[PDB]
Design a protein around this ligand. Structure first.
Ligand SMILES: Nc1ncnc2c1ncn2[C@@H]1O[C@H](COS(=O)(=O)NC(=O)c2csc(-c3nc4ccc(O)cc4s3)n2)[C@@H](O)[C@H]1O
Ligand SMILES: [Cl-]
Ligand SMILES: [Cl-]
Length: 539
């Protein structure tokens, strides 16, 4: 079938050994070099590769001495912090599955998530502690809570350093520690949760084979970023999420300095770029609003920045192109993936640009676009559902065979739930989620296309679009808008503006509501249910 798009061979073949063995190999190289692995942009704290590797090895041994066996389970519950990956790496080193979660989860989300992954130990931030203690009242199999981001015991709980000290031989040498080999294709490495689900979180099981495949992409000269001392990546992406997890682990394989930024004001962003001589940025497109508006760019030395990359949510072509222009870059690089595909499976290839494109199929993957009704494959420039297949496909959801069957079909193709198309040169364009399409009469209007128009308005800081129920037409497109500081637009002004830029079908017949924050999930996808609720309330 000539409609199937097949990714090329990777420059670097997948290496032997577990994901833990590969991380240990590379981290030890950069440790001996003397390089910095993690930096907190706001506090300036650094962890060298040597320190990060040593603590990860020591924690691995500590978890074994505690009594965890291969295929056991631990979890994190933490906002981004520079210590986040110590339990992740330790788990990978010893064959103990790791379930990352974020402090920002609601209690309903967290109790469900940890109830599925069933961690023996939870590594909690100070901020997340109360939620973890609450969850433990329901998920009574959580034996121990360890404080991740404290150098001292806290509220009666051992901190990470204490847990390590109490569970290792005095004078234990990390250099003696051995990574544990596993059955790579079968052994669960991570249990992940997607953002923006309409239901409660499912546990996505990712294997070592999934992760070592990612490691080839991450360092690829075309589909990743190359090893080069002094590379510093400013990252704003949630670490617990696949987007933050697999970019960050990839950057460690690459030897980069991971410059973790948790404050998103323009001044801190730009100061961070300058002060740490950042070469790369990785973000969710929500951050572009600040960059296109900033009047401060030439106050900072931004000469080191050579790449801005976006993922997780639709990026307006025009917004991205304006930001690339401001930073004098050729374009914004992009990746597209799902938690269930480990990482990005469509990435903009270096040297193979196309305006508006999401990118091309990554090495070792295949992709097709199917007709929404017949499920048959489509040629170029035909919209339908993107389907993918390749060695980063998850093992399956935890204890949910029905959901697995719905996602990955009888021919092994993962149905992404996204609308897209590919052009004659095989560049893929991801439009929006199928579930988000607004059924106005016989049209299927993608909110992202209307959101793009709204974001392009200089008085509109943010926007989200969803469908208002309508007896005659089914659904009407409506918008929730956040105005820029000091600016006003009426509902009519917004509607008339949009009407001047779009087809008749795409008019905001469902109206406009003004809010302080557009409801979105943790990686920037619009919360359609929440938007519909706002639009339903009378002004
Ligand atoms: N680039 C994109 N454009 C438009 N939509 C995008 C998108 N990426 C994710 N999405 C949306 O998120 C949904 C998946 O949500 S999710 O489960 O929470 N998972 C994700 O969003 C997810 C998991 S891994 C990942 C990426 N890894 C990367 C590595 C490098 C890079 O430069 C960019 C990326 S994005 N994203 C998709 O189905 C799609 O709707
Ligand atoms: Cl989201
Ligand atoms: Cl979310």
């Amino acid at each position: 079938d000539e409609n199937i798009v097949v990714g090329p061979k990777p420059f670097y073949p997948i290496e032997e050994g577990s994901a833990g063995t590969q991380l240990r190999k590379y981290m030890e190289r950069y440790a001996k070099l003397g390089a910095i692995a993690f930096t907190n942009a706001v506090t300036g704290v650094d962890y060298s590769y040597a320190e990060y590797l040593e603590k990860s090895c020591c924690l691995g041994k500590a978890l074994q001495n505690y009594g965890l066996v291969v295929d056991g389970r631990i979890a994190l519950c933490s906002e981004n912090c520079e210590e986040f990956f110590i339990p992740v790496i330790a788990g990978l080193f010893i064959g103990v599955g790791v379930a990352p979660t974020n402090e920002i989860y609601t209690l309903r989300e967290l109790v469900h998530s940890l109830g599925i992954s069933k961690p023996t130990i939870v590594f909690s931030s100070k901020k997340g502690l109360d939620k973890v203690i609450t969850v433990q009242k329901t998920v009574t199999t959580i034996k121990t809570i360890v404080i991740l981001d404290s150098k001292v015991d806290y509220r009666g709980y051992q901190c990470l350093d204490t847990f390590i000290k109490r569970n290792t031989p005095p004078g234990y040498q990390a250099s003696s520690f051995k990574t544990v080999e596993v059955d790579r294709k079968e052994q669960v490495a991570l249990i992940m949760n997607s953002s923006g689900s309409t239901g409660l979180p499912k546990g996505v099981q990712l294997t070592h084979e999934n992760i070592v495949t990612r490691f080839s992409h991450a360092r690829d000269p075309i589909y990743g970023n190359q090893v080069s001392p002094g590379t510093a990546v400013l990252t704003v992406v949630p670490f617990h999420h696949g987007f933050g997890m697999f970019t960050t682990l990839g950057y460690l394989i690459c030897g980069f300095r991971v410059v973790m930024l948790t404050k998103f004001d323009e001044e801190t962003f730009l100061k961070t770029l300058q002060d740490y001589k950042c070469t790369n940025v990785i973000l969710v497109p929500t951050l572009f609003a600040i960059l296109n508006k900033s009047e401060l760019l030439n106050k900072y030395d931004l000469s080191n920045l050579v790449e801005i990359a976006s993922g997780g949510a639709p990026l307006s072509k025009e917004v991205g192109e304006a930001v690339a222009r401001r930073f004098n870059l050729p374009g914004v690089r992009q990746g597209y993936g799902l938690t269930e595909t480990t990482s990005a499976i469509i990435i903009t290839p270096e040297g193979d640009d196309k305006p508006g494109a999401s990118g091309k199929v990554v090495p070792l993957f295949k992709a097709k676009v199917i007709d929404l009704d017949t499920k048959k494959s489509l040629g170029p420039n035909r919209r339908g559902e993107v389907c993918v297949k390749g060695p980063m496909l998850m093992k399956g959801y935890v204890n949910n065979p029905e959901a697995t069957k719905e996602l990955i079909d009888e021919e092994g193709w993962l149905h992404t739930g996204d609308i897209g198309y590919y052009d004659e040169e095989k560049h893929f364009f991801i439009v929006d989620r199928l579930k988000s399409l607004i059924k106005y009469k016989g049209y299927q209007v993608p909110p992202a296309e209307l959101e793009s128009v709204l974001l392009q308005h200089p008085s509109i800081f943010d926007a989200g679009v969803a469908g208002v129920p309508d007896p005659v037409a089914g659904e009407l497109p409506g918008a929730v808008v956040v105005l820029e500081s000091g600016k006003n637009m009426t509902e009519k002004e917004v509607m008339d503006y949009v009407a001047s830029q779009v087809s008749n079908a795409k008019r905001l017949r469902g109206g406009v509501r003004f809010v302080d924050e557009v409801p979105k999930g943790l990686t920037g996808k619009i919360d359609g249910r929440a938007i519909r609720e706002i639009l339903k309330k009378p002004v």
